[PDB]
Design a protein around this nucleic acid. Structure first.
Ligand SMILES: [Mg+2]
Ligand SMILES: [Mg+2]
Ligand SMILES: [Mg+2]
Ligand SMILES: [Mg+2]
Ligand SMILES: [Mg+2]
Ligand SMILES: [Mg+2]
Ligand SMILES: [Mg+2]
Ligand SMILES: [Mg+2]
Ligand SMILES: [Mg+2]
Ligand SMILES: [Mg+2]
Ligand SMILES: [Mg+2]
Ligand SMILES: [Mg+2]
Ligand SMILES: [Mg+2]
Ligand SMILES: [Mg+2]
Ligand SMILES: [Mg+2]
Ligand SMILES: [Mg+2]
Ligand SMILES: [Mg+2]
Ligand SMILES: [Mg+2]
Ligand SMILES: [Mg+2]
Ligand SMILES: [Mg+2]
Lengths: 181, 39, 138, 261, 113
RNA sequence: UAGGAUAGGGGCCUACCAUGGUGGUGACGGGUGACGGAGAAUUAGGGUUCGAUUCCGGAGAGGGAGCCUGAGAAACGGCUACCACAUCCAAGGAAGGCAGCAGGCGCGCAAAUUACCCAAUCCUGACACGGGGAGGUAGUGACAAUAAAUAACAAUACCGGGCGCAUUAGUGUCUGGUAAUUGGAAUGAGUACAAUCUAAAUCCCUUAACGAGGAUCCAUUGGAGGGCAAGUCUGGUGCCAGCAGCCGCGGUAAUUCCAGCUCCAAUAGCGUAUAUUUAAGUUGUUGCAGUUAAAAAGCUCGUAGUUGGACCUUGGGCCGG
C-alpha cells in the first residue's frame, strides 16, 4: 500500500519542566508581545532553533578547509541570509548560534505586517492574514507563520480582492448598502 | 456499604450562572498578557 | 577496582550480564513472572464482579475503602479492585461487567488501601466518569 | 521463493533510475536481456521519464508497437528492454539518434549523435575462447558473440561494431595509458586516462586512473571501460567531459551562472 | 478579461500531437470551463478542427485567478482516435460507456462448455 | 576409500575401515509472550529497549506425510492418504481448507466497507483490444503527524498608572478591563448556481447569490497544601463520605472531601492504565561503590583468563616554495 511511504514528523516538543514561573512568564512575554495563537507556535520556534544550532555546533566542532565544513556552513549561512535572519557583515557561522527565538518570531508574516503598518495592531495583523487580505507577490497568504524572505519582504501587500486594498466591498458593506438602497 | 453516597447526597444542589464566555486562543493569551503586566 | 585490561572485554561483558540481575527492575521485567500476575502483561482487563465488599484502611487513617471482588474472564483470577469516586460503588452491582486497570505504582499497593492494586474504570459498558458526571446513564 | 520474481517494487529499483517514490508500488522490472539488468534502463524509462514523448504506460506501449523505436540497428518492441551502456537508440520519424552514456554523477544521459557516429557502436569483450570444431569466438558484456576474432583481440578489450557489416572494424587494446570511463560504483561516469594497473593473484585487478585535470582514483576491472586510444575518445562525451566536480565546485558553477545573469 | 499562455510545450510526431502545460490567467472569474477553453485554444493555433483538443488535470491554485492544466493538440482526429485513452473521448462525447454486473461475466460461464 | 542418488559438491545414502568430532573462548541442554535484517523510540557522549507490519531474505497455508504436470512446486485460490473440523445427501455417495479482499462467530483491553475501478504503477496472455480484491479511488478512521478559527477596530463611559503645568490640579497615554455597553467594517464554519477534480462520482482549490451581537456559529481536559502554577474564598460533611502517584487531609472554623465563584497549566486537546526510554553517576567501559551505611573470600597455593620492566638509527644536514 503506497502512501505509507510519504514521510512526516513532529515540529515541536513539550518542555521538560512543566510548571516554572521564570519560563512561564518569559513565554507569556513572547506570546503576548507577538500575538500568537498559543505556545505551540513558540515551541516550534525553539525546535527550529534547536535544529539549526545543532547543525552549526557540529560544523564548528570541525576545522576549516574541511570541505564538509565549508559546504553546509555556506548553505546554512545563505539560508539565514535569504531569511534576512542575519545582518550584513555578520556571516561568520557563530552569529547563527548567537541568534535567539526573537529573531524567528520577528520574521513571521504577522510581525512584518505590523512593522509595515497596514494592521493598526498585531492581533489585527493576524486576523488580516487569515481573512485572505494579503498577498506576497501575487498569491494571497493566510499562514501567519509564513517566514518571509527579504527578497519578498519589500512588496508584502494587500490582495487585489480584499476590500481594503483590492476590489469589491465586503458582505457587511453590501448588506448595509442594499438596505440603505 | 451502608454509607455510600452519604456526603455527595448531603450537599445542596446549586446551579451556575450564565457567564459571558471568555475569549479563546489568541484573544485569551491577549487578555492574559494585557492583564498580568500591561495593567 | 575495575578490570581495565585492553583484552578484558569478555570479563566485563559477562560481569554486567551477571550483575544486572541484582537490579530489581531488570529482574522484575525479565524474570517471566509478569506473565504469571493476574493481568499477565496487560494494561486493562475486563472482568466480572462477584460482590461489592468494602475493606479497612491502614493505621494512620481510618475508613472503609469500597472495593469489589472481581473475576477475570480471561484467566479466572479472582482479585480485589477499588472504585475511585465518591459514593460511586452504588453503580456497581453483583455480577456486572467491569474493566479493571492498574491502580498506580505499577502493580504495587497504593496509599492506605491494604493490598489492592486495581481500579474500576468501566461498568456495563459505560464510562464511570460519565456515571459520576451524569453525562450518560447505563 | 518458487520461481523467478516477475514484479519489481519502486524502492527496490536501481538508484540511478531517478524515479520517484509515491509514483506507484511497482517499477518497470527490466526484462532479461543483453545487459546486466541492474546496470540498465528500460525503454519505458527512456521514453516516458526522460524524453516525455508519452505520459502513461499505455502511451509508451503505443510508441513501441508503432515499430518506430529502433535500438542498435533493429527495432525492439519490448517495453522493459534493458538498454544500457553505449546502446544507441534511434527514431526514424524524428530522424533522431541517441546514445546512452553515464554522466559524472552516476546516472544515464541520452547524448545525441549524428548519423555517422550512430552507424556503429562500441563495447568491451568479456572473454575469447574456442568453440565447436576449434573456431574461436569472443563474448562481450553486451552479450554479443563474435566468431573468428582478430588474433590480437583479447579479453577486457574494446571493439567497434557497425550495424550493417555487423562485425569488427577496429579494437582498442585495454592497456596502460588509454582513456577509460568507469561504469560502476561511486566513480562511475568519470572518464580518465589509465595511469597504473596492478594485479594481485586471485582477486580483482585494480586500475588507477587520472582525470583530465589532475584528480586520481582507483577502480575494479569489471567497471572500467576503454573508449579511445590515448587521450582522445572515439565517442562524443556528454556536457561534462567526464570530470566529476566536487560539490563546492558545482556550487561555484551555479553561483557564477547566477551572477553572469 | 482572461488570458491563456502555454509552456513546457513539445511536439511528438511519434504520436503526432502537440503536448503542453497551459497556465490560464483568469482573474475575477471563478474558473474557465474546458468547453470554453476549447474554442479559444483552437482559434489561436488554427487547428481547423476544435475536437482534436483534449485538456485535463486542472488545479486552480490557492488564492485563485491562476490555473494549470495539460493540453494535447492532435493533428489528425484519426490519430486522436487510435492513440488515446477511451475515457476522455467519452468525456468529449466521441465514445460511450456501458455498465457492468460481474456475476456470470466469467465464473459460472466457465462451468458449462 | 568405492559406489549409489542428485542438476551438482557432500554421510545425502550404502559396504568396508579408522576412533574420531564439540566444550569454562559456554558445546549439549532449557527458556524465549523469539521470524532475521534495513530499521523504531529515546539520546551530550556512551548507551537502553524495541523491530508482527507495506523494502529485502526465509518459512507456512488446519496438523503431518507423499507425488503428477512443468524450465520453474514437495504448489495447497494442484492432487493422494491419515488425524482434527465440517457441508450436501434422495442415506448409495459427494465436496472440502479466507494466515488472499470484504464480511460473519469466537477470543479478547484491543483493530474499518460483504463499496467502485482498471484510468494511473506494473504484471500477465497467442496479446496495442482481455484479465488483474496486485494496485488505485471512495466510506468508517482524534492510531500517529501538519497548517490552523472561536473575533478585530474605534470613540463613549465609573473609572485605572505617568506623560501637557504638576502644584492645586486633574482626566491622559499605550487604552488595561467590569462594560449583554454604542457603532459601522472583516471573514470562514456552514448553505450553495456553476465550473474544476474524477475511470464515474466525492473531497480539496476557485467562486453567482446567502451565511455573526455575543445568550451566540457557546472549548474542553484536569487541577487550586507541598513537589507544582494557581484560594490563610463561601456553603455542606464530620476519622464518615471520600481525596491522595508520595508526604499526608478529614475526630463541627477542612487552604486537601462534596459543591458555587474565582484562578491556573495545556488548549482542539488533555487525563487515565500498562510497557518502555530519560531521570539513572540507582548497572557505571566513558562512569558507581566494599572500615563503620549492602558489599574484601579465614588464609595461602594454583591452570586457563587478564596484565606484563628497560634496550634495537632515521642521529646531523642540504634542497624548494
Ligand atoms: Mg530501579
Ligand atoms: Mg504511612
Ligand atoms: Mg512471494
Ligand atoms: Mg563420493
Ligand atoms: Mg515465535
Ligand atoms: Mg516479505
Ligand atoms: Mg508455499
Ligand atoms: Mg503443501
Ligand atoms: Mg485460499
Ligand atoms: Mg479476510
Ligand atoms: Mg473544571
Ligand atoms: Mg477536584
Ligand atoms: Mg475545590
Ligand atoms: Mg504555587
Ligand atoms: Mg491521582
Ligand atoms: Mg491536591
Ligand atoms: Mg550507588
Ligand atoms: Mg557491613
Ligand atoms: Mg582478610
Ligand atoms: Mg597463569
Amino acid at each position: 500500500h503506497v502512501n505509507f511511504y510519504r514521510n512526516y514528523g513532529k515540529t515541536f516538543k513539550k518542555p521538560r519542566r512543566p510548571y516554572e514561573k521564570e519560563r512561564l512568564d518569559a513565554e507569556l512575554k513572547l506570546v503576548g508581545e507577538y500575538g500568537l495563537r498559543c505556545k505551540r507556535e513558540l515551541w516550534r520556534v525553539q525546535y527550529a532553533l534547536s535544529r539549526i544550532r545543532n547543525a552549526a555546533r557540529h560544523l564548528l566542532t570541525l576545522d576549516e578547509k574541511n570541505p564538509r565544513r565549508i559546504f553546509e556552513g555556506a548553505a546554512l549561512l545563505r539560508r539565514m541570509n535569504r531569511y534576512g535572519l542575519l545582518a550584513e557583515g555578520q556571516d561568520k557561522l557563530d552569529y547563527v548560534l548567537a541568534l535567539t527565538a526573537e529573531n524567528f518570531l520577528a520574521r513571521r508574516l504577522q510581525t512584518l505586517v505590523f512593522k509595515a503598518g497596514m494592521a493598526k495592531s498585531i492581533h489585527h495583523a493576524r486576523v488580516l492574514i487569515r481573512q485572505r487580505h494579503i498577498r506576497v507577490g501575487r498569491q494571497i497568504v493566510n499562514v501567519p507563520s509564513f517566514m518571509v524572505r527579504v527578497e519578498s519582504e519589500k512588496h508584502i501587500d494587500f490582495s487585489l480582492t480584499s476590500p481594503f486594498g483590492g476590489g469589491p466591498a465586503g458582505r457587511v458593506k453590501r448588506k448595509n448598502q442594499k438596505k440603505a438602497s | 456499604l451502608a454509607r455510600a453516597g452519604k456526603v455527595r447526597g448531603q450537599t445542596p444542589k446549586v446551579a451556575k450562572q450564565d457567564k459571558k464566555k471568555q475569549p479563546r486562543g489568541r484573544a485569551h493569551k491577549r487578555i492574559q498578557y494585557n492583564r498580568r503586566f500591561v495593567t | 577496582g575495575k578490570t581495565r585490561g585492553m583484552g578484558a572485554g569478555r570479563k566485563l561483558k559477562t560481569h554486567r550480564r551477571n550483575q544486572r540481575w541484582a537490579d530489581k527492575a531488570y529482574k522484575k521485567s525479565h524474570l517471566g513472572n509478569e506473565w504469571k500476575k493476574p493481568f499477565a502483561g496487560s494494561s486493562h482487563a475486563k472482568g466480572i464482579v462477584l460482590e461489592k465488599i468494602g475493606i479497612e484502611a491502614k493505621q494512620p487513617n481510618s475508613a472503609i475503602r469500597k472495593c469489589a471482588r472481581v473475576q477475570l474472564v480471561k484467566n479466572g483470577k479472582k482479585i480485589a479492585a477499588f472504585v475511585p469516586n465518591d459514593g460511586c460503588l452504588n453503580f456497581i452491582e453483583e455480577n456486572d461487567e467491569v474493566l479493571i486497570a492498574g491502580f498506580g505504582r505499577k502493580g504495587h499497593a497504593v496509599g492506605d488501601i491494604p493490598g489492592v492494586r486495581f481500579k474500576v474504570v468501566k461498568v456495563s459498558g459505560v464510562s464511570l466518569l460519565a456515571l459520576f458526571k451524569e453525562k450518560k446513564e447505563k | 521463493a518458487r520461481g523467478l520474481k516477475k514484479h519489481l517494487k519502486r524502492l527496490n529499483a536501481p538508484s540511478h533510475w531517478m524515479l520517484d517514490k509515491l509514483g506507484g508500488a511497482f517499477a518497470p522490472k527490466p526484462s532479461s536481456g543483453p545487459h546486466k539488468a541492474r546496470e540498465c534502463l528500460p525503454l519505458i524509462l527512456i521514453l516516458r521519464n526522460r524524453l516525455k514523448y508519452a505520459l502513461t504506460y499505455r502511451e509508451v506501449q503505443s510508441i513501441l508497437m508503432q515499430r518506430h523505436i529502433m535500438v542498435d540497428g533493429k527495432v525492439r518492441t519490448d517495453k522493459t528492454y534493458p538498454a544500457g551502456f553505449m546502446d544507441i537508440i534511434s527514431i526514424p520519424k524524428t530522424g533522431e539518434n541517441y546514445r546512452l552514456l553515464y554522466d559524472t554523477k552516476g546516472r544515464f544521459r541520452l547524448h545525441s549523435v549524428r548519423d555517422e557516429d550512430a552507424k556503429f557502436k562500441l563495447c568491451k569483450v568479456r572473454s575469447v575462447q574456442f568453440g565447436q570444431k576449434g573456431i574461436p569466438y569472443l563474448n562481450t558484456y553486451d552479450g554479443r558473440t563474435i566468431r573468428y576474432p582478430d588474433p590480437l583481440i583479447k579479453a577486457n578489450d574494446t571493439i567497434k561494431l557497425d550495424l550493417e557489416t555487423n562485425k569488427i572494424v577496429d579494437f582498442i587494446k585495454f592497456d596502460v595509458g588509454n582513456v577509460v570511463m568507469v561504469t560502476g560504483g561511486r566513480n562511475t561516469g568519470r572518464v580518465g586516462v589509465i595511469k597504473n594497473r596492478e594485479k594481485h593473484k586471485g582477486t580483482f585487478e585494480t586500475i588507477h586512473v587520472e582525470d583530465a585535470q589532475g584528480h586520481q582514483f582507483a577502480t575494479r576491472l569489471g567497471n572500467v571501460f576503454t573508449i579511445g586510444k590515448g587521450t582522445k575518445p572515439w565517442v562524443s562525451l556528454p556536457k561534462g567531459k567526464g570530470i566529476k566536480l566536487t560539490i563546492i565546485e558545482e556550487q561555484r558553477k551555479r553561483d557564477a551562472a547566477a551572477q553572469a545573469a | 478579461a482572461v488570458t491563456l499562455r502555454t509552456r513546457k510545450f513539445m511536439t511528438n510526431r511519434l504520436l503526432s500531437r502537440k503536448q503542453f502545460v497551459l497556465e490560464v490567467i483568469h482573474p475575477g472569474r471563478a474558473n474557465v470551463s474546458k468547453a470554453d477553453l476549447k474554442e479559444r485554444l483552437a482559434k489561436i493555433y488554427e487547428v481547423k478542427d476544435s475536437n482534436c483538443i483534449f485538456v485535463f488535470k486542472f488545479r486552480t491554485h490557492f488564492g485563485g485567478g491562476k490555473s494549470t492544466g495539460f493540453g494535447l493538440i492532435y493533428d489528425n482526429l484519426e490519430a486522436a482516435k487510435k492513440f488515446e485513452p477511451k475515457y476522455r473521448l467519452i468525456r468529449n462525447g466521441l465514445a460511450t460507456k456501458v455498465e457492468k454486473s460481474r456475476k456470470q461475466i466469467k465464473e459460472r460461464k466457465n462451468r458449462t462448455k
